[PDB]
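Example with several molecule types.
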Amino acid sequence: YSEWITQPNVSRTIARELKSFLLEYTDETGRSVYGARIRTLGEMNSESLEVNYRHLAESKAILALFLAKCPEEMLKIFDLVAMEATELHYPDYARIH
Amino acid sequence: MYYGISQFSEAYNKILRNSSSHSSCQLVIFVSCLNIDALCATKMLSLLFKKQLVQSQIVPIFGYSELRRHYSQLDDNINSLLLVGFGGVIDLEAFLEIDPQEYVIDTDSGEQSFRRDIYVLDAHRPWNLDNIFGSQIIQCFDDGTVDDTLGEQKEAYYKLLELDRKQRKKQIHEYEGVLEEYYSQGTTVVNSISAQIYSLLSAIGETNLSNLWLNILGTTSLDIAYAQVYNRLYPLLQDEVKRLTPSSRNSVKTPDTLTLNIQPDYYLFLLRHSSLYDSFYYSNYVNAKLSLWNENGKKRLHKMFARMGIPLSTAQETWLYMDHSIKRELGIIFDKNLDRYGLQDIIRDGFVRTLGYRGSISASEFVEALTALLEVGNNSAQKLTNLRKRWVSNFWLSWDALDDRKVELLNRGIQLAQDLQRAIFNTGVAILEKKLIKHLRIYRLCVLQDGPDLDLYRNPLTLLRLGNWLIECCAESEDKQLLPMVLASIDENTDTYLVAGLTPRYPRGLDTIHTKKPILNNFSMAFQQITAETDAKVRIDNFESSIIEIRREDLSPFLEKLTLSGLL
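Resulting structure tokens for the full complex:
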């Protein structure tokens, strides 16, 4: 599975899918939790994005299965995707973190 | 018109002839304390008369009663008096019990001379017609308004003077009505005293960099309240700065270089002597723009500081110790993320003075420090007099703060300015939480009954600073219509409230057709008419007419009568 994740096209696809999951995951009340999470992450400069396992399991489940099986590389990839999303919300956030 | 701009030098020469006798001191300067522009003007005149070695007396006055008492104590030898920052709206000869016949000497020959000549200098527009026209002792330094817009008033006043049947009474009534509609107008200011005396000095030709700096400070003193006048006068100061600066630009910094520069001076609070985060948090404009008194305000402040990409620790670091990267890209950073939150008007160009290696300083920070030094520099009618004594004493602290050899005093003034901004901010947020402001159809009353540091607001400038905070905050509330607010503060030692009639102002940077029309503070005649009737032991002595001291028991009836009054 880890070698499968190391494939570049797979890496880019997972990056885009995690971007979409962060920007568009909607709960019962309808608000996108992770967009506001990026908002708060930038505002307090927490540098850490608390992403629930249940949210990633419910939507795009194979990503959660991979994470539970081979977290080593997708930690890097999802961290980069979170940084890019923070750049979207907070331009040039790389200065602070 | 009495003294136009072009003939100020004539008044200067007349005063020099009258009192350039070093054997005595026949010239006395009266200055209204708790007024930055008057302090700057008095400093200009003091330096000028130090040049010509004319002995002078400088007396800081707080209240009208003090002025009349000093004039009663004033000796007859003094043939020249100077009033700075007051006296242009009230009947001085009636106030000081003055007739031309006692003071006139060498009456003959169409001319008249007087044993004591008094020269007033204030820019309050309700120019007293009996003082500007019907006297020779009172001498006013007009700034071009009386000679241009009081022609009809001049004609009506002279018609009444010359006339002391039915059509004659009709015309007398018409002239009196014209005079009255000229009166009953809120006290407003169109020019800065510092600019007027700087123009006089340029006519005399004794200008220098220090006098130009004083004029910049005096003009900046009116920016917070009279920003339209500041914009009107800014190009003249800019041109003077361009003219006087030596051509040897970009010279190596020596401990003796004194440089005045025109550079981006953002509309923040003590930027160069406080953290950027605190400058935003304490800036009246930003606070009014986001209503920081609510808990959402601080979160949105962090939101901006994140949005620009500036670390909060960096923003909260002292200005001198910030990284040179941010200190050299502040302008671009503001360009990128200021229009997003509507704070584009923060970016501004001002004058910065640098004295060798002592670091730069902006005019706004300097005038804030001076005001802070004025405010907190250090049975019923006795402790109040002690308060007047302390307030007058703080005037000399603020005066000596002007000396470049007393930078330690300037640092204390900066610390006092920071503390006063903190206190006013906290008081405003507490008031807006408890909603002490009660909205009516006449004025939004707000009385502080108990709480923290209430003894700070018995100083008139502190109450005015709180008024500036709250009026700026309410100005950005478009839902809240234009309406004056009234502030009172009980003095437990004296058991009296300090009622401060204020005036609404247009939001800074909001320039419209109605914005060009100034707001007129009609609390003067309302206060005086309410006080003349129904004796309530009210103490109206401040040169700023919209400030009174009222008995604690009589506060509520006075406010009820004022509500019954529709004058304002």
